[PDB]
Amino acid sequence: SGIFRDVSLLHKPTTQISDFHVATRFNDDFSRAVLEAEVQMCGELRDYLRVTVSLWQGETQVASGTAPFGGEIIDERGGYADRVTLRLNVENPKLWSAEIPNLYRAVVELHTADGTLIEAEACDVGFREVRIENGLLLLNGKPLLIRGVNRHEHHPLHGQVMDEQTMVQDILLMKQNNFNAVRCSHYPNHPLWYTLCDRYGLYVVDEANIETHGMVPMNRLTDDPRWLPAMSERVTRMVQRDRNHPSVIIWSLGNESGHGANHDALYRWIKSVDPSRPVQYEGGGADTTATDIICPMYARVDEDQPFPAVPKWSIKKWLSLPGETRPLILCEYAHAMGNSLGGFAKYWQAFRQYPRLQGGFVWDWVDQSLIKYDENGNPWSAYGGDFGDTPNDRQFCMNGLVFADRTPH
Amino acid sequence: DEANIETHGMVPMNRLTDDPRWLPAMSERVTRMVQRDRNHPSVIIWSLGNESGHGANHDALYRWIKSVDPSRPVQYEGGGADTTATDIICPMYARVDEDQPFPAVPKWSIKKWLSLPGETRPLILCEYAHAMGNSLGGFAKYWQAFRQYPRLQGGFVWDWVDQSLIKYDENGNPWSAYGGDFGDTPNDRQFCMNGLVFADRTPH
Numbered sequence: 001s002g003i004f005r006d007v008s009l010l011h012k013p014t015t016q017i018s019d020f021h022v023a024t025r026f027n028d029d030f031s032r033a034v035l036e037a038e039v040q041m042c043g044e045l046r047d048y049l050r051v052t053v054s055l056w057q058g059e060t061q062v063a064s065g066t067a068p069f070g071g072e073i074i075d076e077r078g079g080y081a082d083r084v085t086l087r088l089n090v091e092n093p094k095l096w097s098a099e100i101p102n103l104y105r106a107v108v109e110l111h112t113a114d115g116t117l118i119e120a121e122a123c124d125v126g127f128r129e130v131r132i133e134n135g136l137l138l139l140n141g142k143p144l145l146i147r148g149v150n151r152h153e154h155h156p157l158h159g160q161v162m163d164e165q166t167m168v169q170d171i172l173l174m175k176q177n178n179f180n181a182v183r184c185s186h187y188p189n190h191p192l193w194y195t196l197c198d199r200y201g202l203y204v205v206d207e208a209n210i211e212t213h214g215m216v217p218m219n220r221l222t223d224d225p226r227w228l229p230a231m232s233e234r235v236t237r238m239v240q241r242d243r244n245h246p247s248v249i250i251w252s253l254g255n256e257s258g259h260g261a262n263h264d265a266l267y268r269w270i271k272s273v274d275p276s277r278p279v280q281y282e283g284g285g286a287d288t289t290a291t292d293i294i295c296p297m298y299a300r301v302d303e304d305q306p307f308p309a310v311p312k313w314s315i316k317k318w319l320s321l322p323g324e325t326r327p328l329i330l331c332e333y334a335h336a337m338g339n340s341l342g343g344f345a346k347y348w349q350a351f352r353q354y355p356r357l358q359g360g361f362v363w364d365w366v367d368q369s370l371i372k373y374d375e376n377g378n379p380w381s382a383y384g385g386d387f388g389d390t391p392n393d394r395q396f397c398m399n400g401l402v403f404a405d406r407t408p409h
Numbered sequence: 410d411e412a413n414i415e416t417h418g419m420v421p422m423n424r425l426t427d428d429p430r431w432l433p434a435m436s437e438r439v440t441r442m443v444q445r446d447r448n449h450p451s452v453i454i455w456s457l458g459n460e461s462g463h464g465a466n467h468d469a470l471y472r473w474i475k476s477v478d479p480s481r482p483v484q485y486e487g488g489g490a491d492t493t494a495t496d497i498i499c500p501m502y503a504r505v506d507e508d509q510p511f512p513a514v515p516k517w518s519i520k521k522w523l524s525l526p527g528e529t530r531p532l533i534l535c536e537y538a539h540a541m542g543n544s545l546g547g548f549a550k551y552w553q554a555f556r557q558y559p560r561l562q563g564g565f566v567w568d569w570v571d572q573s574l575i576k577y578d579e580n581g582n583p584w585s586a587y588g589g590d591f592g593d594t595p596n597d598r599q600f601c602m603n604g605l606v607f608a609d610r611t612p613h
């Protein structure tokens with residue numbers, strides 16, 4: 001517990017940009033795109049205000065649009081006089097992918113017609129389309145093969161405080177070891193992570209901070225309307241913060257919280273508000289009405305584990321169950337606890353052979369060991385129970401592909 | 410129940426079946442079969458024939474039957490085993506786990522076939538486990554898959570009985586003959602004996 005992420009002060013004008021959404025849509029072959037940016041203001045509207053959204057490629061401005069406030073009519077009472085949407089045509093855009101993380105810069109200016117800037121906001125933009133078609137998760141029209149890993153925010157000295165150096169070290173090691181994607185197990189990450197993933201190129205699953213594993217049954221709270229409010233904020237506020245990052249390609253409703261009606265409602269809320277990314281959720285059997293992707297944890301390649309209610313079918317079999325058509329990407333597989341990863345090649349061989357088996361995210365990146373000191377000042381790696389915590393789950397906290405200090409296993 | 414239409418030796422295989430001029434002749438082979446056998450409960454599926462590629466004639470005929478007799482699915486393996494003229498994915502000799510990616514007409518592993526993008530039909534091999542001579546190795550691998558996968562609904566082994574013919578020696582003793590033993594040529598030798606049982610019905 002504690003104040004574990006940054007604290008800042010931000011001084012905005014009273015008439016200000018209060019939110020902005022960037023979307024990119026394409027033609028059939030990706031040779032043309034439209035960048036659409038909805039901008040919202042707070043403060044007093046005045047006829048002289050304008051918003052200009054400019055797109056840059058390096059030091060070169062490639063597109064721009066300017067307009068006064070006042071959105072399209074939306075219903076019988078009119079439109080949002082406090083919003084405006086700018087539409088920029090972009091020819092032959094440089095596409096973003098984990099392989100070639102091409103980025104442009106969008107600058108959003110709140111200014112006056114006669115040229116005075118009130119304030120500006122901005123973001124890096126990656127032109128990419130993510131869609132599921134014919135049962136395949138496609139990026140810029142090509143099917144992905146997710147070489148992913150689950151990554152918790154963990155430091156052996158600092159606990160859950162993340163720093164730039166460490167984040168960078170992790171991405172470099174992931175890329176160095178042929179990973180192309182990461183799942184934010186199991187909560188929104190420090191803001192800087194998204195920026196680094198956008199720039200260095202990794203596909204990200206952004207996941208809401210909701211996990212109720214210890215309830216009995218697991219969906220006790222998630223099926224209760226009384227908890228929909230609290231849950232809703234965990235999902236909505238995550239979307240509101242992270243929706244403009246290109247690295248984020250899939251939203252996740254949380255983890256190990258069974259399957260409750262609250263999941264369904266929240267799944268639908270995201271689909272409505274941001275049609276640009278698939279929504280996944282593993283709870284309740286990995287193939288519920290709240291997920292666009294079959295996303296089991298620890299389902300085996302050839303072997304079925306037919307548990308009641310929530311079976312873990314062999315992944316090859318799952319794909320073809322009567323009426324199923326979704327892509328399958330394991331949210332967690334290959335439990336890297338101690339001397340492990342046995343059978344990893346089995347997964348890969350399957351992923352390569354079956355189009356709809358589009359990979360998975362190993363569990364997990366780094367061991368959650370903590371440093372303790374022996375009377376003599378020499379440090380050693382500690383696990384559950386080592387701080388007098390009890391009950392505890394002993395070494396279950398170390399499941400990484402690398403030791404806490406980033407040395408590889 | 411299958412129409413007496415097979416044009417395997419044509420080049421390409423659908424040369425005649427894609428030719429409207431052969432539509433009439435093909436049409437009688439399918440329609441007269443349905444008119445004759447449609448009241449038998451044992452018939453559960455109609456087949457448009459065998460190894461005649463995939464031609465427009467097949468499409469027309471597949472529709473004809475669907476129209477006249479909705480009570481039974483229609484299958485046809487030609488042209489890739491999963492064309493628009495078949496309600497059932499019905500490959501011949503597709504393997505359990507191993508793909509055989511022939512151009513145009515691949516034979517995918519049956520487990521993989523079920524789940525190709527957009528695929529949703531059941532899969533029943535029209536022919537599998539070629540029992541020629543000392544054979545049937547790997548039979549159990551099919552069965553294990555059939556039982557594990559709902560949509561893998563089995564198959565028809567190739568085939569029941571050896572097509573050997575009896576000939577008599579100089580001494581008048583009989584003996585089992587195959588391709589080429591009648592002076593026939595060219596011929597395909599022993600390929601005519603692929604059965605689980607001998608021509609006299611003794612089991613292999």
Ligand SMILES: CC(C)S[C@@H]1O[C@H](CO)[C@H](O)[C@H](O)[C@H]1O
Pocket residue numbers: 501536600601603
């Ligand atoms: C030998 C292959 C090119 S054709 C193969 O020959 C078999 C021989 O018994 C059967 O006739 C099969 O139906 C046919 O596909």
Ligand SMILES: [Mg+2]
Pocket residue numbers: 391392393394
């Ligand atoms: Mg314990």
Ligand SMILES: [Mg+2]
Pocket residue numbers: 595596597598
């Ligand atoms: Mg010969």
Ligand code: NA
Pocket residue numbers: 145350351352353354355356357358359
């Ligand atoms: Na695949």
Ligand code: NA
Pocket residue numbers: 396397398399
């Ligand atoms: Na763990």
Ligand code: NA
Pocket residue numbers: 554555556557558559560561562563
């Ligand atoms: Na089956």
Ligand code: NA
Pocket residue numbers: 600601602603
């Ligand atoms: Na034969």
